[PDB]
Amino acid sequence: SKPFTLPILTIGELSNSRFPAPIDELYTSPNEGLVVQPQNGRSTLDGELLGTTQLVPSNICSLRGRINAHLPDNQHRWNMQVTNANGTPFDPTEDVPAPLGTPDFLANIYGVTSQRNPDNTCRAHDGILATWSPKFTPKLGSVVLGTWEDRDFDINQPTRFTPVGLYDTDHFNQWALPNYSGALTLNMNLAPSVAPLFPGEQLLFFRSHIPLKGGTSNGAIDCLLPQEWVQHFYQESAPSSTDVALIRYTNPDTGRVLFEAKLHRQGFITVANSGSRPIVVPPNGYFRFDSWVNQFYSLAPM
Amino acid sequence: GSKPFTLPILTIGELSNSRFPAPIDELYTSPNEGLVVQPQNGRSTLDGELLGTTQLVPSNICSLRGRINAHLPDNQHRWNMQVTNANGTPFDPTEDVPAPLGTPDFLANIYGVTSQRNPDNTCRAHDGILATWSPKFTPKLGSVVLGTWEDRDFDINQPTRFTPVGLYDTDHFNQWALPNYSGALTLNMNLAPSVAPLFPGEQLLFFRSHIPLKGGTSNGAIDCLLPQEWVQHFYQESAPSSTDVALIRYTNPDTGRVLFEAKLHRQGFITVANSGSRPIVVPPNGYFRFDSWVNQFYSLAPM
């Protein structure tokens, strides 16, 4: 078989796969009572992308298309038809939950909506992508973008939303999926929920504290795999010999090993740990693949 | 045996700009008559030695982070920021880089958002400008100025980050003009070298993005020598280069149909046999594949 590998990347060299941001720390938590089912940053270990996951980092939580209308309310809102990169409208019959890169959490996402016309005249206005809105219907090919009172966009010109962070904390829940087709509809083609199946284990996350325009929050976005691991597995396509890869967080200069973890075939990590805490790792260290083990493998407790 | 050199399996719609956070929109070639082409982001040798200000994390391209340390005494709503490493230690100007890694490598009014989060999780963010042409843009000395608008304030000595979005306007915009990383009347140091064709009848080939512009008229073109994914691939692979020039061919893997060929130079840039300034259209499913080690005297099939 083509041997399985992880990329040689320290924590300061990793990116979040659910929001455009550097990884700030590793984190573990029980997430009691919640369903953990992110749709970005989802890949099998042998490189099959899942959910809404795609490879281009600047397309994470970005959508593009053409603005088609200014809405007749007092909220300064603009409807956008979502397109592919070639300008063709999104096809709702594609077996994805939503256009690739669509945000996978409820929030008021602060960002900038920009346009460039064929004659190279441009405009951009900061504002909000409300992923909880009844008119957030990206699987139907349309979303609404907000800005402020005095701002206009051009109808039917190429349009892009660049995400920046959270506008505020209203509606923010990183583990609540949007209704990709709007109210009273079921999401489809989802990457499965993930949970520890072995006793004494918790998920391990790659955490970013993303920007927040106003309010009080740690802004935590937890991904199952950093974007670089998604990219690596996609390129490598190494066969998964068992359901679980044993990985160890290692300092390459001294060989000192900090802890060990289970990297599951479906693309997430578990550790033997209790409670919600940040993990501190050596700045020069990174996970190394050790061996393929079985699901009942007992990890050394952190 | 030596590890074979390879390019990643990535179509043009799967590539990223290495000089600005943006997808690649097209390939582009140009003689760039009379200009010195010397970008500092998106620079790597084929064997994976990063050069200039190049670093691996895509969301850190044209970002700076640190701690705001002063509100400046004019009507311009400008804030001085001490640049830091991720752990909060100040940037060390004696590091043999031109500037902190990921620092912008072109003159512009860059539109973005400056955000803060205090230890007690209280936050604030305000849009505004990073003016890389300003006398106060001195990232190699560990400080830059950030603008916002009236009656917007930041906390002194709290963690701060600038997220770039695009161009604020076109004033001072020149993608091939390097900043003065240490300010007025200083020389830039530790630069990745300028690049140009070495063989007659060739031009550079660029991976081009049209980045956002807040107001004005411009195609917003940012041309990189290597997409960010190729920088990332070479860094991981570290395959030794057998000669100074790799012959690469833009190929559709479904049919084997080859569109054109190019030279991928050891120092990390591409040339093609072409004349004139024009975008290039490629098959959506195609990508460059490494064909063979040639050398600089290899005569390319004309595009």
Residue numbers in the entry:
A (entry chain A): 224 to 525
B (entry chain B): 223 to 525
Q: What did the published study say regarding this structure?
A:
There is considerable antigenic drift among human noroviruses, and new genetic variants evolve every other year, which can result in new epidemics worldwide. To elucidate the constraints on non-HBGA binders from a structural perspective, we determined the X-ray crystal structures of the capsid-protruding domains (P domains) of two GII.1 (HV and noro485) nonbinders and one GII.2 (SMV) HBGA nonbinder.
The equivalent residues in the HV P domain were Cys345, Arg346, Asp375, and Gly438; in noro485, they were Cys345, Arg346, Asp375, and Gly438; and in SMV, they were Asn352, Arg353, Asp382, and Gly445. However, our new data indicate that Asp375 in HV, Asp375 in noro485, and Asp382 in SMV are unable to participate in the stabilization of the fucose moiety of HBGAs because of their flexibility or suboptimal orientation.
